[PDB]
Ligand binder design. Structure first.
Ligand SMILES: O=C(O)CNC(=O)C(=O)O
Ligand SMILES: [Mg+2]
Ligand code: NI
Ligand SMILES: [Zn+2]
Length: 331
């Protein structure tokens, strides 16, 4: 069995290997990459996402989110308070202000220590989930707006034609902006490209061990767990690496830098934080290997998770027994 310790693997495809996206994902899985839940892909030196980032300041962040924490430094939730619209140029200036800027630090490890010590005492503002793309239309390789759609994959594998669309999303971050512990909708893959700016640190639990994280989360967030049998779908709970180690939860960590891709694999729980002002693009995708994970994915039916239009068909076709309950939670 390849990668039996479930380490995060790093790949360096050549320009020739960068042509066929599906083939390269299958190659990484042949080497055991999916066992970690997360892989890094460094693009060949010949490749670029677009020519420059000099002209992005007029993008609008319609609903910036202030991420307010509750709990203790290593075990907390966050809620999202909506703020007034601002442009990317305005948000960049805000991220660089004395109130929000990255503190002086020695290295990534010192910054990670400072994040976990101090995160709860601040409320950073995140531009999340903005439909759009920063890939040039002429970029033919690993262009996250030109991937094969999940609806087409389901149709190819299973024969059933369904409604829905699959487009990318932009994320504008600052120091301490936080992504809570989660798997993707319907335990899909994700791919994330860091277009510009400061790094993103990731934490990940191997898919084969995801239920260990879920059982800890139920212990640590006992009111939330009574409220919903899949409350990590709410995307609000944080648990630090120190607390995971104290509780014996298998996990790994890695830092993504600008110009790098990360792939999350089906049922790979992940969480993390941004180091300073940055911009990422991400989208969900599927492969044949995903179908069995989609059929078994948990679902939130309590009302909190609320998701895209396109998840309807995935539930309806893959999980018909759960469909009526889940749809009630959507309404
Ligand atoms: O970058 C972020 O805030 C969150 N991204 C992801 O969870 C992802 O790409 O799957
Ligand atoms: Mg612009
Ligand atoms: Ni994700
Ligand atoms: Zn719920």
């Amino acid at each position: 069995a390849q990668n039996p310790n479930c380490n995060i693997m790093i790949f360096h495809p050549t320009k020739e290997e960068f042509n066929d996206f599906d083939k390269y994902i299958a190659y990484m899985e042949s080497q055991g990459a999916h066992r970690a839940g997360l892989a890094k892909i460094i693009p060949p030196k010949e490749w670029k996402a677009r020519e420059t980032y000099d002209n992005i300041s007029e993008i609008l962040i319609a609903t910036p989110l202030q991420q307010v924490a509750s709990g203790r430094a290593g075990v907390f939730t966050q809620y999202h308070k909506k703020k007034k619209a601002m442009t990317v140029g305005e948000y960049r200036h805000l991220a660089n202000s004395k109130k929000y800027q990255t503190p002086p630090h020695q290295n990534f490890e010192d910054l990670e220590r400072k994040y976990w010590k101090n995160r709860i005492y601040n409320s950073p503002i995140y531009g999340a989930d903005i439909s759009g793309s920063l890939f040039d239309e002429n970029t033919k390789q690993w262009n996250l707006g030109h991937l094969g759609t999940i609806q087409d994959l389901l149709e190819k594998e299973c024969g059933v034609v369904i409604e829905g669309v699959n487009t990318p999303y932009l994320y504008f971050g600052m120091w301490k902006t936080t992504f809570a512990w989660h798997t993707e909708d319907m335990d899909l893959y994700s791919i994330n490209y860091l277009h510009l700016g400061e790094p993103k640190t990731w934490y990940v639990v191997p898919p084969e061990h995801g239920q260990r994280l879920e059982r800890l989360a139920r212990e640590l967030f006992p009111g939330s767990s009574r409220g919903c049998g899949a409350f990590l779908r709410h995307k609000v709970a944080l648990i630090s690496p120190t607390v995971l180690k104290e509780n014996g939860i298998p996990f790994n960590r890695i830092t993504q830098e600008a110009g790098e891709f990360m792939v999350t694999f089906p049922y790979g729980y992940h969480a993390g934080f941004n180091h300073g002002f940055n911009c990422a693009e991400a989208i969900n995708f599927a492969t044949p290997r995903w179908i069995d994970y989609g059929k078994m994915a948990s679902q939130c039916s309590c009302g909190e998770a609320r998701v895209t239009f396109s998840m309807d068909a995935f539930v309806r076709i893959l999980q018909p027994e759960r469909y009526d309950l889940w749809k009630r939670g959507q309404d």
